[PDB]
Design a protein around this nucleic acid. Structure first.
Lengths: 122, 122
RNA sequence: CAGCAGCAGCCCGCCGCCG
RNA sequence: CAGCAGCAGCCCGCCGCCG
């Protein structure tokens, strides 16, 4: 399976996550989760994010309209399939979803949702 | 039930909707649908929207952080409940959801999602 | 636009068990 | 952070019937 993502997953081990809980707080997690679904197949990432501009720029590079289109187009055919982007950060989940015909518009709304959620104030 | 919405619903009748289909196209609907859910209770609106600045300003007034908090607080208690905003326009659905503890953050992301979707280019 | 139904998926809240 | 399970809701895609 070719993934829509350009960065590898960064899920913390159970021990790393416990170490982080012990030393921080829902509003200061190690990072965020995001996922892309195309019909029944779902790709997920956990990515480290520390709220600096450097870190925001890095994690905004985790998928592009091109990389999502390349991965999704594996699953395309005559009938439309459902496509969905989800992102969860600090207790708030955003999902952008529609049919594969509207995929470009879904990626534009998904990237804007991602940037707005990751920059949401204190 | 006190609604989170400050404008009445504007669902078209079946006949009005058919008249509009006949004379337009998924990218030029009469308006958009939006909904607020608080535990099991859901409030919905269809609102007319024609993509002008006047119209965008009007429909952005359909709920505020205050009006959503007043409606949601009817359903609050000790345990958190799930809160969800959804908006669908031109084939793309955005859902912002989380627990009632994060409701203010959900409203901030919901209003930004709404403005960004309603202004999405051709 | 509305309503009912089938198939499939995702997301949220509560809650248990578990690495 | 991961996995399995229960209860409830929402959203998406396909599809039928219907005002």
């Amino acid at each position: 399976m070719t993934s829509p993502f350009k960065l590898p997953d960064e899920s913390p081990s159970w021990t790393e996550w416990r170490l982080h809980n012990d030393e921080t707080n829902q509003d200061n997690p190690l990072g965020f989760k995001e996922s892309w679904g195309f019909g029944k197949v779902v790709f997920k990432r956990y990515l480290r994010y520390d709220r600096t501009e450097a870190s925001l720029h890095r994690v905004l590079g985790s998928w592009t309209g091109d990389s999502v289109n390349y991965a999704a187009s594996r699953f395309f055919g005559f009938d439309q399939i459902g496509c969905t982007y989800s992102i969860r950060f600090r207790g708030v989940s955003i999902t952008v979803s529609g049919g594969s015909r509207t995929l470009q518009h879904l990626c534009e709304m998904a990237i804007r949702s991602k940037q707005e959620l990751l920059q949401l104030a204190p």
